Amino acid sequence: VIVVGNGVLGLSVGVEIARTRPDVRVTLLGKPARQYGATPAAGAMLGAFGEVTAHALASEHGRKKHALAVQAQRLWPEWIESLEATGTAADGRIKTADDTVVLLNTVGHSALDDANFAAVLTALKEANAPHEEIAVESVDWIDPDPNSRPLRALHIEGEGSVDSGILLAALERSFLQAGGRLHPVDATEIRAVVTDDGDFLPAGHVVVAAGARSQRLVAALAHRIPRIYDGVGVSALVDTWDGSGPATVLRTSNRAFACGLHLVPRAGGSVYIGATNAVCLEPRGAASIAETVFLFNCATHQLHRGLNGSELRKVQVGSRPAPIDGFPLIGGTSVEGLWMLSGTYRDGLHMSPLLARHVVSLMDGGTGVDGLREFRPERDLISAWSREEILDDVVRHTMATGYEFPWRLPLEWPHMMETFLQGPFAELADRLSDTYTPPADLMTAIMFSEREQQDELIAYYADVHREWH
Amino acid sequence: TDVIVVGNGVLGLSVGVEIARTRPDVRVTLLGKPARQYGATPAAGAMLGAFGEVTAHALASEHGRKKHALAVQAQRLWPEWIESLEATGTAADGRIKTADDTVVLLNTVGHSALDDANFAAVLTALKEANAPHEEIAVESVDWIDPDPNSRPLRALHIEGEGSVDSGILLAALERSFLQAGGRLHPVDATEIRASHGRVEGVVTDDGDFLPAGHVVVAAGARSQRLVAALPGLAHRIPRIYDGVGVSALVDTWDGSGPATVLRTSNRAFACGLHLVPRAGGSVYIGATNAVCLEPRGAASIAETVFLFNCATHQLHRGLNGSELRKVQVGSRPAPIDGFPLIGGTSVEGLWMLSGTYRDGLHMSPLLARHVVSLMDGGTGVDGLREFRPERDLISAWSREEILDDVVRHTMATGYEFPWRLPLEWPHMMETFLQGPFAELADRLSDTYTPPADLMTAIMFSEREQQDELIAYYADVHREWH
Numbered sequence: 046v047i048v049v050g051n052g053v054l055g056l057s058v059g060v061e062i063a064r065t066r067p068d069v070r071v072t073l074l075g076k077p078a079r080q081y082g083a084t085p086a087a088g089a090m091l092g093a094f095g096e097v098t099a100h101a102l103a104s105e106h107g108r109k110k111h112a113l114a115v116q117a118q119r120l121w122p123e124w125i126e127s128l129e130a131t132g133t134a135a136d137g138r139i140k141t142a143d144d145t146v147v148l149l150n151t152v153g154h155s156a157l158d159d160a161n162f163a164a165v166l167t168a169l170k171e172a173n174a175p176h177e178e179i180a181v182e183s184v185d186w187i188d189p190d191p192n193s194r195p196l197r198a199l200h201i202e203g204e205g206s207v208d209s210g211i212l213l214a215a216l217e218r219s220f221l222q223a224g225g226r227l228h229p230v231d232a233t234e235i236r237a238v239v240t241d242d243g244d245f246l247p248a249g250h251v252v253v254a255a256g257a258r259s260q261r262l263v264a265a266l267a268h269r270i271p272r273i274y275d276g277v278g279v280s281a282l283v284d285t286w287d288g289s290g291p292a293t294v295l296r297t298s299n300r301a302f303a304c305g306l307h308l309v310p311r312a313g314g315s316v317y318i319g320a321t322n323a324v325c326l327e328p329r330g331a332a333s334i335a336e337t338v339f340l341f342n343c344a345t346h347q348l349h350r351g352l353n354g355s356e357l358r359k360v361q362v363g364s365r366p367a368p369i370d371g372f373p374l375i376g377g378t379s380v381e382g383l384w385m386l387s388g389t390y391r392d393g394l395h396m397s398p399l400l401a402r403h404v405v406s407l408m409d410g411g412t413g414v415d416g417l418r419e420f421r422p423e424r425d426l427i428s429a430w431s432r433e434e435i436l437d438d439v440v441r442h443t444m445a446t447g448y449e450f451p452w453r454l455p456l457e458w459p460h461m462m463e464t465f466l467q468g469p470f471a472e473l474a475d476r477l478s479d480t481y482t483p484p485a486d487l488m489t490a491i492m493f494s495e496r497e498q499q500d501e502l503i504a505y506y507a508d509v510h511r512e513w514h
Numbered sequence: 515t516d517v518i519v520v521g522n523g524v525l526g527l528s529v530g531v532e533i534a535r536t537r538p539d540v541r542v543t544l545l546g547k548p549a550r551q552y553g554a555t556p557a558a559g560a561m562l563g564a565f566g567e568v569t570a571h572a573l574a575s576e577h578g579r580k581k582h583a584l585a586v587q588a589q590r591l592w593p594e595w596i597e598s599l600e601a602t603g604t605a606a607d608g609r610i611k612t613a614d615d616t617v618v619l620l621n622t623v624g625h626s627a628l629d630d631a632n633f634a635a636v637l638t639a640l641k642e643a644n645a646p647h648e649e650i651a652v653e654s655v656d657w658i659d660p661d662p663n664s665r666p667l668r669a670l671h672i673e674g675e676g677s678v679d680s681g682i683l684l685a686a687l688e689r690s691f692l693q694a695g696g697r698l699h700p701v702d703a704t705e706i707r708a709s710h711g712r713v714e715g716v717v718t719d720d721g722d723f724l725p726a727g728h729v730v731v732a733a734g735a736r737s738q739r740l741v742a743a744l745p746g747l748a749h750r751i752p753r754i755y756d757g758v759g760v761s762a763l764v765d766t767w768d769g770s771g772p773a774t775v776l777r778t779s780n781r782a783f784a785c786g787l788h789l790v791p792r793a794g795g796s797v798y799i800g801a802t803n804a805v806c807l808e809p810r811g812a813a814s815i816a817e818t819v820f821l822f823n824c825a826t827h828q829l830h831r832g833l834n835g836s837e838l839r840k841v842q843v844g845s846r847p848a849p850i851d852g853f854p855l856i857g858g859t860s861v862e863g864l865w866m867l868s869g870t871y872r873d874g875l876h877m878s879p880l881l882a883r884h885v886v887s888l889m890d891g892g893t894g895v896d897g898l899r900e901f902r903p904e905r906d907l908i909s910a911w912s913r914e915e916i917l918d919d920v921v922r923h924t925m926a927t928g929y930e931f932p933w934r935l936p937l938e939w940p941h942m943m944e945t946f947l948q949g950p951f952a953e954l955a956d957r958l959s960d961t962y963t964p965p966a967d968l969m970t971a972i973m974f975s976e977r978e979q980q981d982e983l984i985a986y987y988a989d990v991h992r993e994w995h
């Protein structure tokens with residue numbers, strides 16, 4: 046077995062294959078640099094209820110994803126125990142918090158933040174999950190600017206965070222302990238694996254978990270595996286002024302174009318703050334000025350003014366694998382022995398133990414986890430929303446980038462922008478395809494891409510229609 | 515991974531048959547004894563009731579118009595469902611279908627405020643749906659020989675609205691379940707075991723433990739009491755009470771029976787008169803309805819006399835000298851908020867199919883297909899999402915609507931007897947009933963109002979049972995507000 050990719054997904058499936066099949070040789074590819082790597086840039090939140098949006102829970106496909114995230118949560122305590130068991134005290138703790146506080150402030154669009162807070166509250170009630178709406182004065186540690194302060198707060202019990210760096214170290218250690226072999230090179234081509242040093246590695250099973258590069262690698266063998274783009278994410282490590290940190294995750298609901306504000310606790314007087322999100326049609330390995338300023342401005346005003354005078358340790362950049370139809374690519378292929386584990390966008394890390402168990406069950410002739418069949422990697426592009434829903438959503442999210450800044454402008458201007466944004470986005474959607482509509486996150490990226498890149502997408506969408514219809 | 519269906523009524527067996535047929539990979543085990551204690555299904559005629567079940571009150575609420583629509587959808591599944599159940603048997607097992615058509619009769623042995631309004635609502639709902647029917651001369655209704663003072667003056671022929679022999683249906687479902695690889699284990703579930711928010715399986719009343727990744731509760735009136743023992747769920751699954759129903763099998767004086775179902779519209783506290791044809795010189799007559807806070811396995815004298823008096827006067831005087839074969843008693847699962855409990859739970863693998871009151875049997879093919887679709891990652895049937903088993907109590911009617919309804923239905927118990935009393939007395943009772951029912955509704959909860967059928971049961975229950983309901987309603991408010 047060859048696993049292509051050394052993120053959380055690759056290493057998680059690697060650990061589970063090595064542990065449950067001691068007969069077979071499992072080799073895992075990928076370099077220590079982890080170029081464009083989502084996992085090392087992640088806090089990371091074990092996001093289930095925190096990830097709930099009104100928009101997600103209005104589509105069948107969105108309610109399934111949520112259900113899987115709830116299932117994944119139950120696996121984490123034993124998964125961590127089994128990964129820490131292969132190490133010692135000095136390797137550090139994977140878990141950094143047990144609980145999450147969701148904050149509602151007015152530094153955003155009412156159409157996102159008010160709707161999403163209500164949807165989180167609802168989803169917690171439906172699932173009988175332990176939680177309570179608490180007084181904002183009872184949230185520990187936070188010291189917001191009064192004009193940016195929360196007026197409502199939601200304590201979610203058993204929704205926590207891991208140190209993504211200690212998790213990766215623990216996965217590598219646990220992989221080696223179970224007989225896995227780490228070969229620090231990149232796959233160049235799947236033969237039905239040729240590595241970038243010129244060598245060839247034979248195998249009867251290849252699992253592609255190469256993050257945002259996963260589809261580009263399998264497509265060479267193009268219109269049957271949905272494209273994966275780079276959801277470029279910026280986060281930061283900060284040494285706090287006094288070495289303190291909050292006891293819980295602190296977060297807002299998901300915001301304009303799947304951005305969001307959160308602070309994940311870390312050991313040793315550090316905190317993680319994140320995270321920006323921009324779908325890019327080509328990969329990008331560096332934060333923009335705008336991304337850095339926006340992340341820092343939100344954290345200092347909405348969470349703790351003490352972060353203003355705190356020391357910047359590191360600006361982190363990773364690529365969320367962003368699937369063109371908005372849903373993951375998990376499981377089997379029309380090619381025997383070819384598996385794919387990618388397109389997890391915001392929550393691959395959270396779902397990793399469940400997704401790893403699913404793919405291993407499939408590889409052993411099982412059915413794995415029930416709800417994951419819809420997310421077969423070899424599929425027609427899913428249409429989880431009407432064109433109408435997506436056009437309302439993309440205009441709302443565009444307006445939200447203003448309210449999240451937050452801007453100050455004449456009161457006539459937001460009404461002007463609302464009406465003048467509708468036409469151009471409606472025109473783009475109609476021009477792109479008669480059948481497929483890109484989700485909002487990707488549609489804004491396409492709107493502000495070159496004409497050549499738009500035309501290439503029109504060809505792609507047309508070639509996919511001919512293949513499947 | 516193993517499926518356990520808890521309950522051997524029409525709902526349990528129907529979902530059992532559909533799981534076994536569409537998932538040949540998995541082992542499906544169905545629990546429940548041949549005694550079918552408190553069983554609604556074996557006490558049912560049963561009518562495939564869609565238009566016959568229409569009341570003015572039902573078609574005035576959003577929730578009521580949805581239920582009606584589902585009943586119309588369920589009707590279309592029955593011909594192929596019967597074909598597929600009879601296919602697993604032979605000639606000598608007998609026919610599931612006993613009639614194709616229903617005649618709705620309007621007589622004056624009831625309240626004008628129910629029977630006149632409900633006859634008009636049935637006529638309207640048939641017209642709206644473009645359903646085949648006609649208002650016919652009463653002299654053209656075959657077989658009936660009513661007492662002239664109890665006779666109908668209007669009659670409504672509904673085409674393709676018929677009846678099944680509930681006993682032959684149950685035998686055919688059991689046979690069809692075994693044919694599709696189901697296993698029947700004739701014991702009762704005592705306890706559902708769950709840990710870390712997932713079903714492990716079922717402890718049975720013989721002491722054994724059966725493991726499963728899917729448990730479907732279709733235990734009729736016992737369904738909520740079984741799931742409520744799990745953490746938090748006591749105030750998250752709406753209570754189901756016993757709609758105790760009395761019916762009878764009669765061997766007719768001459769071996770004859772009507773070619774159609776004969777029925778009135780639904781009457782005081784969802785209590786109705788009907789005759790369902792049977793093979794071999796027998797007829798089914800039903801059916802009484804009384805919500806009881808504890809289960810009851812035996813007919814009262816009052817229920818027996820009322821059922822027999824209505825049938826002999828309003829349908830056929832020949833039934834008076836006809837032989838009583840059997841008095842039947844079953845519990846219609848009566849949900850506290852008046853709507854079914856169908857679908858998924860906060861516990862993974864735990865499904866519920868119950869609280870169907872008067873029409874679970876009719877809706878069984880549709881409800882079975884819905885739950886199987888949900889179990890296979892589908893969305894099932896559109897309108898049934900509203901009836902999720904894990905919910906705040908639904909408030910489908912204002913307190914005002916329910917207080918008018920409970921007084922009207924109370925008065926209807928008089929006109930349906932039918933009573934003979936001084937003409938001042940009904941006006942006195944109308945005015946003196948309003949205060950006590952208004953007082954009870956206000957005392958019970960600031961937010962929830964029990965539907966009329968349940969409110970009258972609460973009115974005439976013990977003070978301890980009323981206080982327990984005040985606590986229940988309060989605990990449900992704290993859980994969901």
Ligand SMILES: Cc1cc2nc3c(=O)[nH]c(=O)nc-3n(C[C@H](O)[C@H](O)[C@H](O)COP(=O)(O)OP(=O)(O)OC[C@H]3O[C@@H](n4cnc5c(N)ncnc54)[C@H](O)[C@@H]3O)c2cc1C
Nearest residue numbers: 052054075080083084090231232256278363392393394395
């Ligand atoms: C800013 C940010 C914040 C995040 N926050 C969260 C969070 O709060 N909660 C959460 O659950 N998740 C979070 N995530 C991660 C999210 O869940 C991702 O979906 C997940 O990390 C994807 O993991 P992966 O293994 O698929 O990809 P990656 O983590 O990108 O790993 C793929 C690896 O493959 C390597 N690779 C590329 N090409 C090749 C090749 N040819 N051969 C071999 N290896 C190759 C890459 O270098 C990389 O190391 C965050 C990500 C970002 C960027």
Ligand SMILES: Cc1cc2nc3c(=O)[nH]c(=O)nc-3n(C[C@H](O)[C@H](O)[C@H](O)COP(=O)(O)OP(=O)(O)OC[C@H]3O[C@@H](n4cnc5c(N)ncnc54)[C@H](O)[C@@H]3O)c2cc1C
Nearest residue numbers: 521523524525546551554555561703734759873874875876
């Ligand atoms: C008098 C009367 C007339 C009716 N007429 C009609 C009609 O004309 N048309 C119509 O559509 N419907 C009719 N119904 C029935 C109505 O449709 C019901 O809603 C329906 O039968 C309910 O079916 P069920 O399978 O949920 O419950 P039931 O038929 O009550 O079956 C539940 C079964 O589960 C068993 N059980 C209980 N506890 C356990 C346990 N722990 N483990 C295992 N098994 C257990 C019970 O003994 C019972 O056999 C009538 C009912 C009655 C009482």
Ligand SMILES: NCC(=O)N[C@@H]1[C@H](O)[C@@H](OC(N)=O)[C@@H](CO)O[C@H]1/N=C1\N[C@@H]2[C@H](O)CNC(=O)[C@H]2N1
Nearest residue numbers: 283284285286287345350351352353354355356357
């Ligand atoms: N251009 C220099 C300047 O503005 N000096 C400030 C000045 O002395 C007062 O501020 C105003 N506005 O007069 C003062 C009130 O606290 O804070 C100062 N600013 C600081 N001091 C902090 C420490 O060196 C450590 N960490 C930081 O980030 C520094 N920022």
Ligand SMILES: NCC(=O)N[C@@H]1[C@H](O)[C@@H](OC(N)=O)[C@@H](CO)O[C@H]1/N=C1\N[C@@H]2[C@H](O)CNC(=O)[C@H]2N1
Nearest residue numbers: 301302304322323325333335336443446489490493
């Ligand atoms: N949260 C996502 C978001 O705001 N997306 C923007 C969105 O698509 C349009 O702007 C609004 N406000 O709607 C659009 C107009 O050019 O610019 C987007 N922003 C960008 N694109 C840049 C490139 O990826 C590289 N460098 C950056 O710093 C990125 N910033």
Ligand SMILES: NCC(=O)N[C@@H]1[C@H](O)[C@@H](OC(N)=O)[C@@H](CO)O[C@H]1/N=C1\N[C@@H]2[C@H](O)CNC(=O)[C@H]2N1
Nearest residue numbers: 765766767768822826831832833834835836837838
């Ligand atoms: N207590 C004796 C009695 O009253 N006998 C009746 C009596 O001879 C006449 O009626 C009056 N009122 O004199 C007579 C007119 O038909 O009916 C008699 N009753 C009957 N015969 C029926 C058959 O046995 C079958 N099933 C019944 O229900 C029986 N009822």
